[PDB]
Design a protein around this ligand. Sequence first.
Ligand SMILES: CCOc1c(F)c(S(N)(=O)=O)c(F)c(NC2CCCCCCC2)c1S(=O)(=O)CCCO
Ligand SMILES: CCOc1c(F)c(S(N)(=O)=O)c(F)c(NC2CCCCCCC2)c1S(=O)(=O)CCCO
Ligand SMILES: [Zn+2]
Ligand SMILES: [Zn+2]
Lengths: 261, 260
Amino acid sequence: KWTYFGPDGENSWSKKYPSCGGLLQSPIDLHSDILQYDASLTPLEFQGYNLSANKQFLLTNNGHSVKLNLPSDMHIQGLQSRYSATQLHLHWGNPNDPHGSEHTVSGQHFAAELHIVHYNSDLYPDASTASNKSEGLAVLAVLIEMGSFNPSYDKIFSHLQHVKYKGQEAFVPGFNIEELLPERTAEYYRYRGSLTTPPCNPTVLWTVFRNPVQISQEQLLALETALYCTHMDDPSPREMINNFRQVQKFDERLVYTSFSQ
Amino acid sequence: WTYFGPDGENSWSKKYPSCGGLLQSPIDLHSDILQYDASLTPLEFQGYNLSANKQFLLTNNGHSVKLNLPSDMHIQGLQSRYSATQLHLHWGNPNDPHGSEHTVSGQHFAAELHIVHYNSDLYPDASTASNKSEGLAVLAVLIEMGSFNPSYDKIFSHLQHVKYKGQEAFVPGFNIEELLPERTAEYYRYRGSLTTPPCNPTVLWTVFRNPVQISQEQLLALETALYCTHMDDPSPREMINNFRQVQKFDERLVYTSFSQ
Ligand SMILES: CCOc1c(F)c(S(N)(=O)=O)c(F)c(NC2CCCCCCC2)c1S(=O)(=O)CCCO
Ligand SMILES: CCOc1c(F)c(S(N)(=O)=O)c(F)c(NC2CCCCCCC2)c1S(=O)(=O)CCCO
Ligand SMILES: [Zn+2]
Ligand SMILES: [Zn+2]
């Protein structure tokens, strides 16, 4: 029954989900005082991201975001373990305030944020098992700015009107997921953190790319207006907007960067 | 409650329900939510020139350093008289010296001074006012690093004597208006809450537009002088990062006394 607004909003998550009040919480504000170059943060390699256009992948409204299920033959290499994809999802604001990224950079929110969730498939048989374990998850984050129309993100957004309500599912033809990534993926921030939603487990290695991507105002408006947190028959409908957590205290962490300037 | 660890701000709402309710402060002050309001005329600070023949109690309460203020000190200009009760500060730490509560265009200032007042027309004391309608008014001064500030040193010169939780010192009266910035006629105004437990949504906030300056050495003293633990605690903890994160603030405006 957790939400991002009202009595069950983010200041209340810890009442039911103790880790939301614990250490290592995400998201965070990426600002100069807490950044440190780390020359060991070499490029990631994206393996299996080119999904076949003749296959299809399940898109679901889970009542909190829209998520696309991804095949476990999709993985990121370059980490000390291989991590296999499990799903991607987004966070966004609202039509009157299109400023709903989770991470901020030097105190500024971006329009929206894409997260590609992966689990340690060297160590664990599935993402749920990995999720409460040491080194379990790795999330890639792409900051999204209002800008030009993005045909690659539209491969997801063109299906919004078919997953309007909680529990609804649709199929999306495969496409190359690396088209959702920005320029210069070798430039990223890296830190230890958590899931940004309940249960807030502190088991996520975050990689936030330095450069944002653009999607148009019209794409953001569709994202911000198409979806409901509630089921199709709910007498108290709730729009799915502003589904981002506020930034969290650092608690002595640093954020390591693969770029020195 | 604490500002860190398991009893930190995401857990306040367990014991202090209002911390998860409406009208929470602090917030980011940014151009999209600002609206000029011609009704926001200058405040008058009466009784702020405190007798130098009087002393005023400075305490480390384990959360901040607070100075008790007399009720004959009051703001004029609001519908009711609001009488002073105390002032205190929020700050960051030497590795990240950006610990204001309010942000401006997403940016923290170095520190923030708050002068708390209560509606003495309606209520007999601040504690009684704190959970009631129109109960509280806080004045907020944003602090940045710059020139040595003699006025802030009238407080900061006493910090050594309030190093540990529970410790107190007497401060001789001085003109509190000296702690306020230039052009106090320019301010942001909104209805919000206490930024600490119990987080009651009973605060009329006035955040002055213009910051004050203090020296690099004054800010480092604030950030390093105090612990949040008792003297005899075998596990001492420095008092740093004593600010709440900004809160969501949707479908609302912050009113400004300035348009330019
Ligand atoms: C609003 C989106 O919700 C997130 C979420 F924000 C994050 S994040 N931002 O990457 O921390 C998520 F990782 C997930 N998905 C998970 C997939 C791994 C499966 C284990 C349990 C939950 C995490 C999900 S979610 O699966 O969409 C909902 C999980 C509720 O526990
Ligand atoms: C870290 C400083 O704590 C604040 C504080 F942050 C605020 S603020 N930022 O102005 O909201 C406060 F107002 C207070 N003091 C108030 C005095 C009025 C008396 C009744 C309740 C406490 C609030 C205090 S406090 O009195 O120092 C601690 C209150 C714990 O209930
Ligand atoms: Zn996410
Ligand atoms: Zn305060």
